Specification:
homodimer; 89 residues; mainly beta; Archaeosine Trna-guanine Transglycosylase, Chain: A, domain 4; 3-stranded antiparallel beta sheet; globular; C-C chemokine binding (chains A, B); glycoprotein (chains A, B)
């Protein structure tokens, strides 16, 4: 039998920041259904990650706090400025 | 410690159809983070469910096959026509 009551879930993956959930620097969000990966282009004015600014090469040494990151906004699939200073985790 | 490698997942829920995944008739998709529900207005031209057309009140009696449904497209948060005939499950 089919289950008419079961919705099809789609899950998309974002970076946590003090300016909210971020799309990647290419404004292309990675997503999955129950059977496949797929990309979604972020909508215009969505927040996107521009840069991750770590102090060292070894994340665990600074992972008791968030890290510094620059945040832009999506404009026709490009992460546009001006950049804003956030904390990411 | 924080886990810099962990993305924040957001999951949204759609109806399966022969015309692809559908938003509800109000073009408002139900979603959740790991801590909360939230709604998202579907983007313009997304497919939306207009009607579910069951033959009986008791779904299990027809659940060996999909059910008949009408499909529209979202226009500024309203499910617009013309309607298309699909099978939903």
């Amino acid at each position: 039998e089919d289950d008419y009551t079961a919705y099809a879930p789609l899950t998309c993956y974002f970076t946590n920041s003090t300016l909210g959930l971020l799309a990647p620097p290419n404004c292309s969000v990675l997503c999955n259904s129950t059977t496949t990966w797929f990309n979604e282009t972020s909508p215009n004015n969505a927040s996107c990650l521009l840069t991750v600014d770590f102090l060292t090469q070894d994340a665990i040494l600074q992972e008791n706090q968030p890290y510094n990151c620059s945040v832009g906004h999506c404009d026709n699939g490009t992460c546009a400025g001006p950049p804003r200073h956030a904390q990411c985790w």
